[PDB]
Design a protein around this nucleic acid. Structure first.
Lengths: 95, 77, 103, 74, 90, 69, 92, 102, 96, 78, 79, 97, 102, 92
DNA sequence: ATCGAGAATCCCGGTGCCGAGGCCGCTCAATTGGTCGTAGACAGCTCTAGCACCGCTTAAACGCACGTACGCGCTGTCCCCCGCGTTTTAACCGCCAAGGGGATTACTCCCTAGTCTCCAGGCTCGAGCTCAATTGGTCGTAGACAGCTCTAGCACCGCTTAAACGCACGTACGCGCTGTCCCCCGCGTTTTAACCGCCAAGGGGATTACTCCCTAGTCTCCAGGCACGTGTCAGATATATACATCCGAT
DNA sequence: ATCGGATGTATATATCTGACACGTGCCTGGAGACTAGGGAGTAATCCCCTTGGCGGTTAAAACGCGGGGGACAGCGCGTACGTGCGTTTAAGCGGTGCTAGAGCTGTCTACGACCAATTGAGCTCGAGCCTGGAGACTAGGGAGTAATCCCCTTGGCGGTTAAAACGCGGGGGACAGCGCGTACGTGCGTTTAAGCGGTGCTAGAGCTGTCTACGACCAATTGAGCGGCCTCGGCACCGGGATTCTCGAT
């Protein structure tokens, strides 16, 4: 059996929009946060809840940005988001 | 370490954003966008830590940075 | 006798008064200001908790969790306006698929 | 316009009087009735002329009008 | 360390006697109350400053509510504030 | 009042209609036809006027009467 | 597969006016087409009337006026009489 | 039923539903479907009356479309109302022009 | 034996004005309808009652047109309908 | 060339129903043209409705609406 | 009354031109008017609130500047 | 007669109004609009002249920026004409709707 | 004066007084208004520098709002600082999207 | 009716940077608006910093952190340089 | 045109028998009873717009003869052309026969709404202390209150550029097909995220000390603010040069 | 495509002036010392604890990848829309001129809010049990996906009735011609059309206020519709009576 292209994508949208768990793996995110922090101030440590706060913020930002990106894609009578869509969303947001 | 934000993770974020199909070129671009966001917030966050003469970034530092960047975060006060 | 009881409130009028006095907002604070502020905060809490409870009951849960709060806030136009730039941790998003994306 | 204003006005008020009492009229309502009646009559005379030529005549006679009105459904 | 937890719980018992609240949800409620407090108090402060007044009164609170809250939320909040101040004064 | 629609007026309408010669009996027939038309249109106009609870027939009532036939 | 029509009501009226007379499927179909046609005419004229008078409601007045525009002479008078009688008994 | 309260045979409730769903106006008064149903009932009664008369004239106990055509065309006001209407299997009125006879 | 021209015509007139059966052959009309529709959209199908509806409509239209044509012929003190009669009937009806 | 299926005796029969006693040989071709014109105009409108409904079968109702909007109301196929 | 119609078609065209717009659909104009009205309403509401707080009957330039600052569109030079 | 091709004069007007700074809405009709809207909040209100000019400056600045964003959204869809759907998308991403 | 002691043109005393009466803190350090005045002076100097440059580019000797808008918007960091600010009588930067030209 | 403004100080800075350049009244108004706006931003952030750190005093440190938070990049570095030089000169 | 014969078609009476007309069982969906929030619909009070209506004026328009030649209607002949019957031919109709996309169905798998244990998750009782009422003044902020004077409002008159309105019209929006890319779907290999848990120690968070640094109160003189009088730089006007657009051709 | 040539803008350009900066004069109020007092930021120091890290273990997401099927960026084509004129009113604007009324500043006086202890309660924290969410788990329904069948749509193949189409001659079409009575143009006497003021009055339209009647929504329901079955009205068959046009005779 094989589902047609798009059916399972929509299924995943419903699944993950129904639920609330954080979607980026903890450890690679932590390494990224520490790497970025190292270029501003040396010898920094992090509280666990500080990293969880940063991850919640990043994923919320990306989900909202992807919603706007999707709106830009549908505007161009497409269903696939492309870099120019992200760039439009960020330009209009004022980033 | 930016490569640790894996392809399936970005796909999952896009799924939560309602996206059904994803161009192959989105992923590197998304990482760049993410990096910029993190940099800005963290730049501000560490600044708060430095004013208090502390060496540990707290959840409140991040919450304050996000709020003053118009991205107020609830529940971590 | 507490000020909240005289004002018919649940939120702490005295505490709100102390936070106004110590929040560096003005040199002096009138006696009616913390009553009004506590009343406004209580009103908003009752409305938000009302809607979140309703959402919880649709989901057959007896305890309100952040998901019900997100549904309550985003599904109410004026609350959504008030919190347009607010992220509720562990809230997720509203179910919404663009019609053009459906088969 | 080819019909005189005042006799038309009087005719309109006379006919209206037998349906409802105490009526008054806006000026533009009577002018509207006059444009409509004259346009209708011109069209009817066109059809009448076609009926007359059909009978190898050049003179419109009442049966021409009556035929035109019968085919129009009046 | 102060919080509004007991007052949020009292309100919950008023509106839903048999309903509870999770720790995270209670934290979110505390975030909510602090946020709206800061917004309204700050706007009231600006109103008083703008008008060269040294006193924050219920009128500044009410005007700040009218500026911050949309439509029905604003009207009902103003109604609750007036009722509460009238009950308190007597 | 029907006699106010004179013979030369009917002649002028027929001239605009392209008629070159007109039998003497045409005029009365034309007057009758005109009367019938007027009756029908005005009946509709007054019907519209009464629905609006007015005592003045307006231009719009007449336009509506013409549209509905 | 439920297709509604006015057939049984037409048959009751037929039995009112001609107790020992029936009606064929083709003729009944003609009657149903007729009823829908007249329905459309009256309702449409009433809608236009309400629009014309900046009213959002079609009332018995619009129905009555539409009947007067659409039905000829004595037929119109009798229909108006039946409608008015029906409305006064219904209101009571 | 509302039809019974109004003394009618045609369905007031159904007429009301059709007014509601024909997208003619946003609101519908309570008397409008009663009036429309009453008018529809009268016209139905008149056509069936004339068609029955024609049927008996033809020594038929059953009304057929032919009887409907005779009924409609032999009545000036019904003929006016249905001037642009075709009654299927109705035929035409018997009519020979006097000038055509020998 | 021979009837004079017109007597049998009148008999046929009475006959048709008495009956109701459709006067165009079913199958050639069906072919006509399918052809005309096909010159608008290829591969169309038709419900039977749709074709019967078009045929009923066509015959009713033509009989009425022939009534008006006959009145136009009589107006010209003729008994024979001519193309100019059809064109007059359609001009006064407002179809042409 | 299906217009030729409207035969000479068929047009004669139609004329008989119309009360016509004698028919010139040129009438028949003229009648066919008129009929053809009529069909185009009706069928065109009918097909528009079918196309509006995204259907592939022209129904009796499509025809009833075409006739209605042409002012040639036909009763009984609703 | 009906003063929103004073924002004419050529004026909206001029604004779009300054915004770099080369061609403008006919439906834009009515749409733009609605948007403008909402914006004005939102600003003026806040402005009038300030006037009422100050127990004044004249809306001042500072009331408008403050309203704009509050909604997030700070306007310089009118204080 | 001479006739410019569609777009040439549009570009000339674009250059003209981005080169200059004068207000683009008529003073008096805008003033009537402002007074009408304010009166629908409180009757008998007065306005300082500079208050009306401030409101007008704000509206025109807002509209020019909004039209910039609409233009960017239109070009994204490989169009050159801004349409209502462009305004609603631009405002949705701005967070106004 | 404190401005002279600090080598500044902006008024340290006035900034200190406005801080005292702005309800920012119960107490204000002696260095805070000096620092603030210095920052305000620097930013004023940078905006006036760029606006003067633009003014001379236009062969004008007086800076008008148009030059201020050009100065602010043509500098990425100043444009960022004043990203949500409307400069009255500033106009916009000349800019036509490449796809619209012939 | 005494209304204070920054006009003379803005004008002195202008004469420092452009000795033969003037300024319009509207532009001077924009400069006063600008200085007041940036003042408000910096003072408010410094107040928030002091509160956040349970300090009752706004010092040059609060100003410095607010400047670093509010100003972008190289502009922030130059502003910090100007402020530090000014504070060290004042202290001596 | 009218008298009789008459034959061929129609009408009619009477009849076997069959197919829609008529009527019941069961359902179930559309219908309807009762309730409530609401506002559109009605009703009530103003006014001045436009019309019912007329007193005079003129004058094209209209009523009334002259005659008068012209199309309208009757009438004899011609023809050509179209119905009537015969015979011929062939497509129409019955039906019979099968086939082909259409078709809604049923025929298969994978989730989702719903069940059954097992707790971690707050829920409850007692000790506690930092914080919320109290009151009697103080002093200062602020609410009435008096004039004034500027400025917001309102009207009137040019007039002048702008805006509102037909009229081409070519450019672009929109649409359909499409060759091709390339994005998603399972599989199945393999990390590598996640878990358990253990340890350490750098720093955070709190504790107490204390010393420099902030505030406030008084007097001053002097920089900044209100005007003030006055150029000259930007706004206004022909001059003119060049710099784009745009129609016949490389 | 770039090249002539023409228009047709803009861009700079000398020429000229009045209104907005600009330097000036004078006042007061506010930044400045300064002295002293009161008080918060700094500095060890101590506990512990939370977050690194370790380090081993493990199973679930990530990766690579091959397959295939569905958007994609054109590419061309239809037609319909916005634009750019050119013209004729609407009114925006500046000109002037008024004309109050509400900001505005300044005064006065009761009041209200900040304290300074001073008390007494509301609350936070620690044990002490508990109890209904999370997870493991199961049948119900959705889901695609074929895939056997209904409804038509062609093809065969005849009776068979009806079309074809011919010949005929019977008879309107129709042409021409002629006689008539009747509109037509025209000219003259008259009458009311138009229409100019000029008045006086109901009510169309509008502006406030309130309430009935309706959507609409839920909860019980019974009338109609669909199918199944019974039954004779009519419907064609056939045979007899009439009638109805047709031909000999005046």
């Amino acid at each position: 059996h094989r589902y047609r292209p798009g059916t399972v994508a929509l299924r995943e949208i419903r699944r993950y929009q129904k639920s609330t768990e954080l979607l980026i793996r903890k450890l690679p995110f932590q390494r990224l946060v520490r790497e970025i922090a190292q270029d501003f101030k040396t010898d920094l440590r992090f509280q666990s809840s500080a990293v969880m706060a940063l991850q919640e913020a990043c994923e919320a930002y990306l989900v909202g940005l992807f919603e706007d990106t999707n709106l830009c894609a549908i505007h161009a009578k497409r269903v696939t988001i492309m870099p120019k869509d992200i760039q439009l969303a960020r330009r209009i947001r004022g980033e | 370490n930016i490569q640790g934000i894996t392809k399936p993770a970005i796909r999952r974020l896009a799924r939560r954003g309602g996206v059904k199909r994803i161009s192959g070129l989105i992923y590197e671009e998304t990482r760049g966008v993410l990096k910029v966001f993190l940099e800005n917030v963290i730049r501000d966050a560490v600044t708060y830590t430095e004013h208090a003469k502390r060496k540990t970034v707290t959840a409140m530092d991040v919450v304050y940075a996000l709020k003053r960047q118009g991205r107020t975060l609830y529940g971590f006060g | 006798k507490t000020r909240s009881s005289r004002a018919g409130l649940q939120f702490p009028v005295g505490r709100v008064h102390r936070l106004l006095r110590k929040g560096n907002y003005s040199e002096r604070v009138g006696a009616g200001a913390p009553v009004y502020l506590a009343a406004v905060l209580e009103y908003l809490t009752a409305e938000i908790l009302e809607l979140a409870g309703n959402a919880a009951r649709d989901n057959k849960k007896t305890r309100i969790i952040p998901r019900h709060l997100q549904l309550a806030i985003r599904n109410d136009e004026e609350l959504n306006k008030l919190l347009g730039r607010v992220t509720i941790a562990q809230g997720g998003v509203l179910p919404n698929i663009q019609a053009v994306l459906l088969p | 316009l080819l019909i005189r204003k005042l006799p038309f006005q009087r005719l309109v008020r006379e006919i209206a009087q037998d349906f409802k009492t105490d009526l008054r009229f806006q000026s533009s309502a009577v002018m509207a009735l006059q444009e409509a009646c004259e346009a209708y009559l011109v069209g009817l005379f066109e059809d009448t002329n076609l009926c007359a030529i059909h009978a190898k005549r050049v003179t419109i006679m009442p049966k021409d009008i009556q035929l035109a009105r019968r085919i129009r459904g009046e | 360390k102060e919080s509004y937890s007991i007052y949020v719980y009292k309100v919950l018992k008023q509106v839903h006697p048999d309903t509870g609240i999770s720790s995270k949800a209670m934290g979110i409620m505390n975030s909510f109350v602090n946020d709206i407090f800061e917004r309204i108090a700050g706007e009231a402060s600006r109103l008083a400053h703008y008008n060269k007044r040294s006193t924050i009164t219920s009128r500044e609170i009410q005007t700040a509510v009218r500026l911050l809250l949309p439509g029905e939320l604003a009207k009902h909040a103003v109604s609750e504030g007036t009722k509460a101040v009238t009950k308190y004064t007597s």
